[PDB]
Design a protein around this ligand. Structure first.
Ligand SMILES: Nc1ncnc2c1ncn2[C@@H]1O[C@H](COP(=O)(O)CP(=O)(O)OP(=O)(O)O)[C@@H](O)[C@H]1O
Ligand SMILES: [Mg+2]
Ligand code: NA
Ligand SMILES: [Zn+2]
Ligand SMILES: [Zn+2]
Length: 340
């Protein structure tokens, strides 16, 4: 029996139901833009469970016994079986509010509130936004527009590895015992991503040394002329959202000779490294279900910093992700099996 929880399913990148899940992902994204949290969650859970299937749905009979497939979702699956397309997802792709919100929030520094403001002002294109004489932009948005074409092109594995080298070189200069781990999509086996994420931790660094590392690393890059954008502002761990200048010569896999890359660095206390690694590896749906399973099935409270047992009234310690899964009573799910 397929569990309703992503943390009790193995979800690899070989999706046999991309026709269904691409449509369900568009409908979920539209509900997120329209602030319809409930309908968003229903489409996300349905899409997630279909991603775990070891076979493609080819008839409505194939959906029997699958959880998280409500009547609305089954109508969408039925329609795709009928003519290979989703009329509902096609209408979203042609909707002016959906097109505008996707386009505006694709700019680094632009969220739902700014996207909504620009749409209600009558803006539909980034060219008209950028060239407007009355609009005032945040420092994040200015960087978002300046490096737009590089940031909107996907980061591949040779680029991610070239960034990892840069991060490690900088970090070990100030903390030689530091452990630097690539997290996010790339840790789950993905070939591409919109950014590169790293978890940094040090077994011997003091509270002050831990606090100063991201300032030291970014000042070092600022001096080297590689820091294009930097925000050291917050999970509750110290983190930074950056734009780094990646020289093409550093990539072992034409233009200006470099590419702007979105990089996120997270510094955590050594003792919480397993909780942080688990939270930053993802996927988003895998994390949501892990936390929901912990609460509803185990009366435990899980986040990126700790695991608390409400019955035993104790915090549970872990040196690895495997120990967290064991505390929760779950079979271990490998990072490449967390693509829920
Ligand atoms: N601010 C935050 N607080 C807690 N957890 C976070 C977080 N930001 C991200 N995460 C978790 O860490 C991961 C990476 O951050 P993001 O780059 O924004 C999404 P991603 O799908 O994992 O990478 P992608 O750009 O390759 O698609 C996600 O899987 C996410 O669930
Ligand atoms: Mg990521
Ligand atoms: Na954005
Ligand atoms: Zn990120
Ligand atoms: Zn916390």
């Amino acid at each position: 029996k397929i569990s309703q929880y992503a943390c009790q399913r193995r979800t690899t990148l070989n999706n046999y139901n991309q026709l269904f899940t691409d449509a369900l992902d568009i409908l979920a994204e539209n509900d997120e833009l329209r602030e319809n949290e409930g309908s968003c969650l229903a489409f996300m859970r349905a899409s997630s469970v279909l991603k775990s299937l070891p076979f493609p749905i080819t008839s409505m009979k194939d959906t029997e016994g699958i959880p998280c497939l409500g009547d609305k979702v089954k109508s969408i699956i039925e329609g795709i079986i009928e003519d290979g397309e989703s009329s509902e997802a096609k209408a979203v792709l042609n909707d002016e509010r959906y097109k505008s919100f996707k386009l505006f929030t694709s700019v680094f520094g632009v969220g739902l509130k700014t996207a909504e403001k620009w749409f209600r002002m009558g803006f539909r294109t980034l060219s008209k936004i950028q060239s407007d004489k009355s609009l005032r932009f945040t420092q994040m948005q200015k960087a978002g527009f300046l490096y737009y074409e590089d940031l909107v092109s996907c980061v591949n594995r040779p680029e991610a590895e070239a960034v990892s080298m840069l991060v490690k070189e900088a970090v070990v200069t100030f903390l030689p015992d530091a452990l630097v781990t690539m997290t996010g999509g790339f840790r789950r086996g993905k070939m591409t991503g919109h950014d590169v994420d790293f978890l940094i931790t040090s077994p011997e660094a003091t509270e002050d040394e831990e606090q100063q590392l991201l300032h030291k690393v970014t000042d070092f890059w600022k001096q080297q002329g590689l820091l294009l954008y930097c925000d050291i502002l917050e999970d509750h761990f110290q983190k930074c959202f950056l734009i780094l200048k990646l020289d093409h010569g550093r990539v072992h896999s034409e233009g200006k000779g470099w590419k702007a890359i979105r990089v996120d660095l997270v510094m955590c206390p050594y003792d919480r490294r397993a909780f942080a690694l688990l939270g930053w590896t993802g996927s988003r749906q895998f994390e949501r279900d892990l936390r929901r399973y912990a609460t509803h099935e185990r009366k435990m409270m899980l986040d990126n910093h700790a695991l608390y047992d409400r019955t035993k009234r104790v915090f549970l310690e872990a040196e690895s992700e495997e120990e967290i899964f064991a505390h929760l009573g779950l079979d271990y799910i490998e990072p490449w099996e967390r693509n829920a």
